[PDB]
Enzyme design. Structure first.
Site, PDB file in Angstrom:
ATOM      1  N   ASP A 174      -8.760  53.379 -10.698  1.00  0.00           N
ATOM      2  CA  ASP A 174      -8.773  54.812 -10.959  1.00  0.00           C
ATOM      3  C   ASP A 174      -7.381  55.375 -10.691  1.00  0.00           C
ATOM      4  O   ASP A 174      -6.476  54.608 -10.343  1.00  0.00           O
ATOM      5  CB  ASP A 174      -9.807  55.537 -10.122  1.00  0.00           C
ATOM      6  CG  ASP A 174     -10.271  56.886 -10.650  1.00  0.00           C
ATOM      7  OD1 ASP A 174      -9.521  57.515 -11.435  1.00  0.00           O
ATOM      8  OD2 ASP A 174     -11.407  57.305 -10.303  1.00  0.00           O
ATOM      9  N   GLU A 200     -14.457  67.071  -9.616  1.00  0.00           N
ATOM     10  CA  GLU A 200     -14.041  66.250  -8.455  1.00  0.00           C
ATOM     11  C   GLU A 200     -14.129  67.047  -7.162  1.00  0.00           C
ATOM     12  O   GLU A 200     -15.064  67.850  -6.923  1.00  0.00           O
ATOM     13  CB  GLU A 200     -12.649  65.610  -8.721  1.00  0.00           C
ATOM     14  CG  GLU A 200     -12.754  64.645  -9.899  1.00  0.00           C
ATOM     15  CD  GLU A 200     -11.479  63.866 -10.186  1.00  0.00           C
ATOM     16  OE1 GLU A 200     -10.836  63.387  -9.215  1.00  0.00           O
ATOM     17  OE2 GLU A 200     -11.106  63.745 -11.374  1.00  0.00           O
TER      18      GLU A 200
END
Ligand SMILES: *[C@@H]1O[C@H](CO)[C@@H](O[C@@H]2O[C@H](CO)[C@@H](O[C@@H]3O[C@H](CO[C@H]4O[C@H](CO)[C@@H](O)[C@H](O)[C@@H]4O[C@@H]4O[C@H](CO)[C@@H](O)[C@H](O)[C@H]4NC(C)=O)[C@@H](O)[C@H](O)[C@@H]3O)[C@H](O)[C@H]2NC(C)=O)[C@H](O[C@@H]2O[C@@H](C)[C@@H](O)[C@@H](O)[C@@H]2O)[C@H]1NC(C)=O
Ligand SMILES: *[C@@H]1O[C@H](CO)[C@@H](O)[C@H](O)[C@H]1NC(C)=O
Ligand SMILES: OC[C@H]1O[C@H](O)[C@H](O)[C@@H](O)[C@@H]1O
Length: 602
Positions: A285, A491
């Site tokens: 990621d 997020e």
């Protein structure tokens, strides 16, 4: 002489072995390097032999860019890569997680928690197909989707990217993958990568593993659970992904019992690669290897060693490629990482590029440009939005007349609330900007526009964003639609310990509903404290984050279709119950997993 890797008639594994046996060390490390388009240039790409590019959220060639500007951007990067000595085409990735959502004018589908409410894997397959066409309309070949996290606490800021707290619903929604990539052959071996051709995109199951399991839903934190829990809750949808040929897997920022997934060799190599037999590539990621350490990026050289030895194939750096390439060359030249770990990584990246047709069709197809925002896609998104609505209440007492469906012909109606006319609130995060935004950010229909489009020409429609009570009681309305809810978040910005909606929300509902019978439409990425909204409202509909096509909301409100949606998550009574999931001991919900009222079409 003859170059077998350039021969399109040869088996994939022969083309991979032939090319791999020609590559130098620089060319191999270049394949493992993914960089953001903001730091890319034609020389960077050619001199560092770069294997992949991405756009992060909101990373676009211009605001308002048409599909052909995207195509020209991607082709100009591709001409640099095709001009290197071996001419290995790059693959370009993007977060196309509810439609091609970075791009102006793309169809914006409901986020995944609303898709969970539909209980229709076939619809989600169809959304994957339409998504692939709109991503290929911009020239892009690779989507970072689906998120198959199993969100276990709604306080996480990514709970709306999860289809369900129930891993069985998540499993059945892995049908997105063959929508995105194409159906796998009768021939097919679980764990092989598959993409059917130039109208399809490579997909990405993320984030491996236990990203929705973290303590207190804190984003990126620690998942505390025993192996059997891991394997029975968070893991099973990965194995369904192997069976549908998912091309790539993305590793989570999160830890498992204190071990960083980006440094977990047991799970990444021992389980994903050697037990599930995954044969695509594993991608980190965004600055995932940096975050292995605390502070993040304080021993980058360790981050490179631990993540490449854990089994990661491609590193989303994604800015500082020079440091990544230098350190990684150093470890290989010192014998600290063996050549066979490099060749495995590059084998996997090349396998997916050859299998999807990339060497044969490296460039964008200008005729696909008009797939972007195509009307048949917007009708599909409209149908999805409509099937994701959960009717929680239809009448204040059991003897009250049902308020929904509403008549289309009424002397005068009120549309109120901060979410009634705000396209960006209706789409939520990962829409145009990384964090989403407010206002008219792209093409679509708000709730107020959907209402004007649905009613009889003699119905008068008044809009007031936050009317007072006296305005409502003297206006002569037959009924009100009031739309309120969360603001867009993505997020960690969505991590939320209180789970109550911003004001004005509750006071608009209380004002509107105290003066006239009201249908309350709640836009949110998860369950929120709901009791006070429930108590004021005659009808209350959880609309989740329905995306660009707001006429899916009014289709059900006015009775062209019945409500069929069901809760894909548990609705709590208070945030001190959490976490609380179907199965738990303290299970005491306001509404159970699986609840929704229905109506019939008129
Ligand atoms: C329950 O927990 C959450 C904790 O995450 C908390 O919400 C967060 O509160 C933070 C501040 O304490 C806030 O950060 C500040 O944001 C300011 C600007 O905020 C606007 O823009 C952001 C970014 O787009 C939006 O997400 C915000 O929601 C906010 O939006 C504006 O909101 C008002 C009010 O409804 C609205 O009229 C405007 O039109 C709207 N505009 C837009 C662009 O949407 C910064 O300037 C500042 O420096 C801080 O960093 C977080 O934004 C917020 N998180 C989210 C996702 O909302 C929540 O707090 C309650 O709600 C917020 C909105 C605020 O009004 C608080 O006073 C209030 O307490 C908390 N709830 C409770 C009951 O504690
Ligand atoms: C979890 O969050 C806390 C901050 O709240 C942090 O100190 C801790 O190291 C985090 N754990 C992981 C594994 O990230
Ligand atoms: O923007 C690319 C990546 O950004 C970060 C997110 O964790 C991940 O889901 C996403 O694909």
């Amino acid at each position: 002489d003859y170059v077998l890797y350039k021969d399109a008639t040869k088996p994939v594994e022969d083309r991979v072995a032939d090319l791999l046996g020609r590559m130098t060390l620089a060319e191999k490390i270049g394949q493992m390097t993914q960089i953001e388009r903001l730091v890319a240039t034609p020389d960077v790409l050619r001199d560092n032999f770069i294997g992949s590019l991405l756009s992060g959220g909101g990373s676009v060639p211009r605001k308002g860019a048409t599909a052909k500007e995207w195509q020209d951007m991607v082709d100009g990067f591709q001409k640099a890569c095709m001009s290197t000595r071996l001419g290995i085409p790059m693959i370009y990735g993007i977060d196309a997680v509810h439609g091609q959502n970075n791009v102006y004018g793309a169809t914006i589908f409901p986020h995944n928690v609303g898709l969970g409410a539909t209980r229709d894997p076939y619809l989600v397959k169809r959304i994957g197909e339409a998504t692939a066409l709109e991503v290929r309309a911009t020239g892009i070949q690779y989507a970072f989707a689906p998120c198959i996290a199993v969100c276990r606490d709604p306080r996480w800021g990514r709970c709306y990217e999860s289809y369900s707290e129930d891993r069985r619903i998540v499993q059945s929604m892995t049908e997105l993958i063959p929508g995105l990539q194409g159906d796998v052959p009768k021939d097919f071996t679980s764990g092989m990568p598959f993409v059917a051709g130039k109208n399809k995109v490579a997909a990405c199951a993320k984030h491996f593993v236990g990203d929705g399991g973290t303590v207190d839903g804190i984003n990126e934190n620690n998942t505390i659970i025993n192996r059997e829990g891991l394997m029975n809750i968070h893991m099973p949808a990965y194995k369904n992904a192997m069976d549908k040929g998912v091309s790539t897997v993305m590793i989570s920022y999160s830890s498992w019992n204190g071990v960083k997934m980006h440094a977990n060799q047991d799970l990444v190599t021992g389980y994903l690669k050697d037990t599930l037999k995954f044969k695509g590539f594993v991608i980190s990621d965004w600055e995932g290897i940096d975050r292995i350490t605390t502070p993040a990026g304080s021993d980058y050289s360790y981050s490179v060693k631990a993540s490449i030895l854990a089994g990661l194939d491609m590193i989303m750096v994604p800015n500082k490629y020079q440091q990544f390439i230098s350190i990684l060359t150093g470890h290989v030249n010192g014998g600290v990482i063996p050549m066979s770990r490099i060749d495995d990584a590059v084998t996997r990246i090349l396998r997916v590029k050859f299998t999807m047709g990339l060497f044969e069709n490296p460039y964008a197809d200008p005729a696909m440009a008009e797939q972007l925002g195509k009307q048949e896609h917007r009708d599909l998104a409209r149908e999805a939005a409509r099937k994701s609505l959960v009717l929680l209440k239809n009448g204040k007492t059991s003897t009250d007349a049902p308020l929904l469906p509403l008549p289309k012909k009424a002397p005068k109606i009120l549309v109120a609330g901060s979410h009634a006319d705000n396209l960006g609130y209706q789409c939520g995060g990962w829409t145009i900007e990384w964090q989403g935004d407010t206002g008219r950010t792209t093409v679509g229909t708000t709730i107020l526009e959907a209402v004007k489009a649905a009613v009889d020409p003699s119905t008068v429609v008044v809009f007031a964003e936050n009317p007072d009570a006296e305005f409502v009681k003297s206006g002569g309305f037959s009924y009100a639609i009031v739309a309120v809810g969360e603001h867009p978040y993505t997020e960690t910005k969505g991590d939320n310990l209180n789970l109550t909606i911003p004001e004005p929300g509750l006071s608009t509902v209380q004002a509107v509903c105290g003066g006239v019978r009201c249908a309350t439409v709640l836009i949110s990425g998860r369950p929120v404290v709901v009791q006070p909204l429930l108590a004021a409202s005659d009808a209350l509909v959880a609309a989740w984050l329905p995306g660009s096509e707001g006429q899916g909301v009014t289709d059900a409100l006015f009775g062209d279709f019945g409500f069929t949606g069901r809760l894909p998550r548990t609705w709590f009574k208070s945030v001190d119950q959490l976490p609380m999931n179907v199965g738990d001991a303290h299970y005491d919900p306001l509404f159970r997993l699986g609840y929704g009222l229905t109506t019939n079409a008129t």
